[PDB]
RNA sequence: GGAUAUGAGGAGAGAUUUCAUCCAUUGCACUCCGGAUGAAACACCGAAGAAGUAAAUCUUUCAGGUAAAAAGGACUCAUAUUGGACGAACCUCUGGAGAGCUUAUCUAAGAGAUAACACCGAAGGAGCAAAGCUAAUUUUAGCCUAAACUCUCAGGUAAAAGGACGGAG
């Protein structure tokens, strides 16, 4: 849990469609900076999680201070921070 | 060999894609990757029954099926029972699938012979399962072991021939 681009969030709820997912989570991180990806899958050993890359670690930040156990879908947001971004900021 | 019983062996082809609920999961990733049932969308198979035919494993795929398992399974063998040894071999007819009409050379070269790689499974051919019979304690050792399974020596991948199987006198 060290600062970082990437955050990871997860105990959201396991029965969204990847896709209508993808879109409630950068409907409601954008507000905080510029989204770069929003992760997500649903194979066993990644379900009910996701992460959301910002372009500034003052994005990623702003928007975990703030949007914490935050009522998302019956269920309380619980983020924290990554291990390390492998994109276009990682490698580059 | 038939017909029921039961034990045993028995192939093909989606470990597809959407979707409804149950069972698990608090999990730190940057190829898309957990089970259990159901209900649908194309794709595929030939071995319950079924339907075309004289019948069939040929042939259609309505029903049925599509990792192993599990169930299913034309056929195959073994005990028990019933009986026919005038649907029992033999002989004639004929329906009968699969997979290279690949390249080299012999003489003239899409044919055939021979070698080569690539296959197929239905003449023929080798190998087994329970049972069976021996035998040194659950252990068990042995030999005996059907088949379209298994394999592919011979055999076959355009026609012709062949052809397990089926029916017609
Ligand atoms: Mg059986
Ligand atoms: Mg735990
Ligand atoms: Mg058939
Ligand atoms: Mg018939
Ligand atoms: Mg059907
Ligand atoms: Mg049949
Ligand atoms: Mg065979
Ligand atoms: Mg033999
Ligand atoms: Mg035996
Ligand atoms: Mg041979
Ligand atoms: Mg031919
Ligand atoms: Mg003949
Ligand atoms: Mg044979």
Known sequence: ?????TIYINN???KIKKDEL??????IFSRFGQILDILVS???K????????FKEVSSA?????SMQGFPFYDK???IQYA????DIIAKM
């Open 76 to 78: 309380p947001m619980r």
């Open 46 to 53: 990644m379900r009910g999680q996701a992460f959301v890359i």
């Open 61 to 65: 930040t702003n928007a975990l201070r």
């Open 12 to 14: 959201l709820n396991e």
């Open 22 to 27: 993808k879109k409630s989570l950068h409907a």
């Open 42 to 44: 649903r194979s066993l």
């Open 1 to 5: 849990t060290r600062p970082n681009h």
């Open 83 to 86: 291990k390390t971004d492998s």
